[PDB]
């Protein structure tokens, strides 16, 4: 018995609404992807199948592009990799855009696979394309993706009889652009891109009543507020650390809509997000383009070097509540954790705690993860009362956003028991 149902909204296309009253933390839907792939930066760093990082990965011998954590993952991935393998090998050394590799997997799944549970409420065929809202520049970009797909897939798909009935590649890429999900690992690093057509029914809010979280490729949809019968379910499509102007640009560019929510009408939190000297944070925002690229490719030493030059600059500095400063602290923290620089990681992480309380109101999985990271760093440094407070706060958030079905909650329970045993021996 589903707790959610598809419906036709008055002015947002189709949507999802509650069939029963919902409480924070309630699991509403869970889904594997219709199709997914590792993303550009994480290719060869994480396993193609389970999206977990490993010090050494085994490569597919035929294409040498797909890489796996284990013989189990390589073999289990073979049915969904078999046809793309010949295309990837034929295209070497050229690697396709993520969207092109993704749509290849969509096509093979729809041609060769049984009907997917991911499409229970809504299918790839049903997805919004927004084609009549596309500007000419966007249509041109989609045409180039179509031609890139035809080149990449030529070994496996030569004509329309090898595509699903009435399949239009331009329309398919339009759907991919507006309906791709960024798959994040347990630490909230972007590691993949996938299509989850039933989850695509969720419309956007900058102050949503639901949240999604990834456990490998698996997606969990949970309520994060009380929700009444008939009430529309929403998620936030975007990073919370964005001004209303930034959200406006991305929602127009990628999703072809103008957001009418209260936060956008009132520029909610914009002024607090942009405190400090504008010339300074404009420079930091510029530097973050490279920092974000380095982080996406797991280049932690390079990330840390650039972040330290900002955090410890000889020149003017920013308040930690400035969102570009905050992003630099976040990246520096994550780099230090991955490099084993645990004292420095804790310094940066502790500084983010109050800004995160302000910018992630309610129960948000990203703040849950951040607080867990800080609590774990404090546990390792022997600060048991401080660690316990943060681990308990992380649990209060993550019991709602992640839940028992997410493996990170089991990890958190072990940290809480270890911290508690230390306190009791003191």
Ligand X SMILES: Nc1ncnc2c1ncn2[C@@H]1O[C@H](CSCC[C@H](N)C(=O)O)[C@@H](O)[C@H]1O
**Which residues does the annotation place in the binding site?**
12-14, 47, 50, 60, 63, 69, 73, 81, 85, 122, 130, 179, 203-204, 237, 257
Strand pairing category for 234-235 and 203-204: parallel
Q: What is the DSSP string of 220-283?
A: EEEE-S-B-TTPBPEE--S-SS--HHHHHHHHHHHH-----SHHHHHTTTHHHHT-S-HHHHHH
Q: Is 291 in the site for ligand LUP (CB under 6 A)?
A: yes
Torsion from C-alpha of 337, 342, 345, 346, nearest 10 degrees: 130
Q: Which is nearer to ligand X, 172 or 387 (CB)?
A: 172
Quick one: tokens of 202? 């969720």
Q: Which of 200, 215, 234, 363 binds ligand LUP (CB under 6 A)?
A: 200
Q: Which stretch binds ligand LUP (CB under 6 A): 30-38, 94-102, 183-191, 417-425?
A: 183-191
Q: Which of 2, 13, 62, 82 binds Zn ion (CB under 5 A)?
A: 62
Binding residues with ligand LUP: total (CB under 6 A):
19
Q: Which stretch binds ligand X (CB under 6 A): 73-81, 98-106, 254-262, 328-336?
A: 254-262
What's the min distance (Å) between Cβ of 309 and ligand LUP?
Answer: 15
Residues 6+ apart with CB under 8 A from 35: 80, 102, 105, 106, 108, 109, 194, 195
Q: Is 377 in the site for ligand LUP (CB under 6 A)?
A: no
Q: Is 203 in the site for ligand X (CB under 6 A)?
A: yes
Q: Is 261 in the site for ligand LUP (CB under 6 A)?
A: no
Q: Which is nearer to ligand X, 185 or 200 (CB)?
A: 200
Considering only CA atoms, which of 343, 268, 342, 281 is closest in space to residue 313?
Answer: 281
The whole-angstrom separation of Cα 84 and Cα 284 is 40
Q: What is the DSSP string of 74-137?
A: HHHTHHHHHHHHHHHHHHTT----HHHHHHHHHHHHHHHSPPPGGGSS--GGG----GGG--HH
Segment 79 to 98, residues that bind ligand LUP, using CB under 6 A: none
Which of ligand LUP, Zn ion, ligand X, none interacts with 60 (beta carbon under 5 to 8 A by kind)? Zn ion
Segment 14 to 33, residues that bind ligand X, using CB under 6 A: 14-15
Which of ligand X, Zn ion, ligand LUP, none interacts with 85 (beta carbon under 5 to 8 A by kind)? Zn ion
Positions that interact with Zn ion (CB under 5 A): 47, 49-50, 60, 62-63, 66, 69, 73, 85, 206, 259, 261, 263-264
């Amino acid at each position: 018995p589903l707790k959610v149902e598809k419906f036709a909204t008055a002015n947002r296309g189709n949507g999802l609404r509650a069939v029963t009253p919902l409480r924070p933390g309630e699991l509403l839907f869970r889904s594997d992807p219709l199709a997914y792939t590792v993303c550009k930066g994480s290719r060869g760093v994480v396993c193609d199948r389970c999206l977990l990082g490993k010090e050494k990965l085994m490569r597919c011998s035929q294409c040498r592009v797909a890489k796996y954590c284990s013989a189990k993952c390589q073999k289990k991935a073979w049915p969904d990799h078999k046809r793309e393998c010949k295309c990837l090998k034929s295209c070497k050394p050229r690697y396709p855009p993520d969207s092109v590799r993704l749509l290849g997997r969509v096509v093979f799944k729809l041609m060769d696979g049984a009907p997917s549970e991911s499409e229970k409420l809504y299918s790839f065929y049903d997805l919004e394309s927004n084609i009549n809202k596309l500007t000419e520049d966007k249509k041109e970009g989609l045409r180039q993706l179509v031609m890139t797909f035809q080149h990449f897939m030529r070994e496996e798909i030569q004509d329309a009889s090898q595509l699903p009935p009435a399949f239009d590649l331009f329309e398919a890429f339009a759907k991919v652009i507006c309906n791709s999900f960024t798959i994040c690992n347990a630490e909230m690093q972007e590691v993949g891109v996938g299509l989850y057509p039933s989850i695509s029914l969720l419309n956007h809010s900058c102050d949503p009543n639901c949240s999604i979280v990834f456990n490998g490729p698996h997606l969990l949809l949970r309520a994060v507020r009380d929700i009444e019968v008939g009430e529309e379910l929403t998620i936030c499509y975007l990073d919370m650390l964005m001004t209303s102007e930034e959200r406006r640009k991305q929602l127009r560019d990628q999703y072809c809509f103008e957001c009418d929510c209260f936060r956008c009408q009132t520029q909610d939190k914009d002024a607090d997000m942009l405190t400090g000297d504008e010339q300074v944070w404009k420079e930091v925002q510029e530097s973050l383009k490279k920092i974000e690229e380095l982080k996406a490719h797991w280049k932690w030493e390079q990330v840390l070097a650039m972040c330290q030059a900002i955090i410890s600059s000889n020149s003017e500095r920013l308040p930690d509540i400035n969102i570009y400063q905050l992003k630099v602290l976040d990246c520096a923290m994550d780099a230090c954790i991955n490099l084993g620089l645990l004292e420095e990681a804790l310094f940066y992480g502790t500084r983010t705690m109050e800004p995160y309380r302000i910018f992630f109101p309610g129960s948000h999985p990203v703040r849950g993860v951040q607080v867990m990271k800080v609590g774990k760093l404090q546990l390792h440094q022997g600060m048991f009362p401080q660690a316990m407070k943060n681990l308990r706060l992380a649990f209060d958030i993550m019991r709602v956003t992640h839940g028992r079905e997410h493996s990170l909650i089991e990890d958190l329970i072990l940290l809480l028991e270890e911290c508690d045993a230390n306190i009791r021996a003191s």
